[PDB]
Design a protein around this nucleic acid. Structure first.
Ligand SMILES: Nc1nc2c(ncn2[C@@H]2O[C@H](COP(=O)(O)OP(=O)(O)OP(=O)(O)O)[C@@H](O)[C@H]2O)c(=O)[nH]1
Ligand SMILES: Nc1ncnc2c1ncn2[C@H]1C[C@H](O)[C@@H](COP(=O)(O)NP(=O)(O)OP(=O)(O)O)O1
Ligand SMILES: Nc1ncnc2c1ncn2[C@H]1C[C@H](O)[C@@H](COP(=O)(O)NP(=O)(O)OP(=O)(O)O)O1
Ligand SMILES: [Co+2]
Ligand SMILES: [Co+2]
Ligand SMILES: [Co+2]
Length: 218
DNA sequence: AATCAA
């Protein structure tokens, strides 16, 4: 059925480090040094465990990347948090328009707390520095707003013997809030059938990202 | 019970 298919698709889409992943706990993240398996993602989908995925594989390539749009410390102010939520959506729209201009299929996720991830998937892994370079150049073309931060994952071009950086992956529970981390549409509305949306996510052509990298400069 | 990174 669609739901077990989505388990195998999740594995193929959020494939990062071959033999290490992470789990979100209250107060941080903990590396689990073993390959991810089916049960780990059933724990993810059920709310039992929440998974993060190290982007960089051992040869310093990634099969996916993501923008991380954050509403920074609102704290008190005048409960104007709405303006900053509005600002987070404007910034994501701006990033997303540039991605479609460059013909890069991408997907929005509500993160369960203060923002949105923009996910880009590839059919074959590409060099971490290439897509990082692309995503910095696109960030540089757009206006930003007060209270908003934009982070680019991968955060490093190369492991240097380490693990690199991880990102919490969708369809699970943000421990900080109890909310589901869910895909939304082009106007930030929650998809009703999260499973079917996942089963229809399209991968970009690695052969077209590589050409774009060179064209973006040379 | 809690790491690793920029
Ligand atoms: N690897 C790693 N990344 C972290 C850690 N803490 C924060 N980050 C990441 O670094 C980003 C910026 O760090 P901070 O500005 O200190 O965290 P923040 O919670 O966004 O800060 P404010 O919202 O401004 O209070 C966060 O949004 C995370 O992506 C950590 O302990 N390890
Ligand atoms: N202590 C840690 N150790 C390792 N990785 C960590 C980490 N804290 C965060 N990360 C990693 C995991 C995170 O997924 C990623 C982004 O950090 P956020 O922006 O702070 N958290 P998210 O975007 O997922 O949801 P929201 O912002 O709405 O609260 O950095
Ligand atoms: N004076 C106004 N007139 C019309 N809509 C208005 C408005 N003030 C606010 N709105 C609101 C009501 C509308 O729901 C909303 C539309 O704003 P986006 O979704 O950000 N722009 P688009 O529709 O083109 O989306 P996309 O690019 O993906 O195709 O703005
Ligand atoms: Co962040
Ligand atoms: Co975030
Ligand atoms: Co619209």
């Amino acid at each position: 059925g669609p739901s077990q298919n989505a388990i195998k698709r999740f594995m193929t889409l959020f494939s990062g480090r071959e033999d290490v992943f992470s789990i979100q706990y209250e107060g941080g993240y903990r590396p689990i040094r073993r390959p991810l398996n089916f049960q780990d993602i059933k724990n993810h989908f059920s709310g039992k465990k929440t998974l993060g995925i190290y982007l960089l594989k051992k040869n310093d390539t990634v099969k996916f990347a993501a923008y991380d749009i954050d509403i920074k410390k609102h704290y008190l102010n005048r409960e104007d948090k709405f303006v900053y939520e509005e600002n987070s959506k404007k910034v994501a729209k701006r990033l997303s328009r540039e991605l479609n201009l460059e013909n890069i299929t991408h997907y929005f996720e509500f993160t369960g707390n203060r923002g949105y991830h923009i996910w880009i998937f590839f059919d074959i892994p590409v060099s971490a520095y290439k897509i990082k370079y692309i995503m910095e150049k696109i960030l540089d073309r757009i206006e930003l707003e007060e209270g908003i931060d934009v982070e680019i994952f991968p955060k490093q071009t190369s492991l240097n013997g380490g693990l690199g950086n991880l990102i919490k992956v969708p369809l699970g529970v943000h421990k900080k809030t109890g909310k589901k981390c869910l895909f939304v549409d082009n106007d930030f509305n929650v998809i009703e059938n999260q499973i079917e949306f996942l089963n229809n996510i399209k991968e970009n052509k690695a052969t077209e990202i590589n050409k774009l990298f060179r064209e973006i400069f040379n």
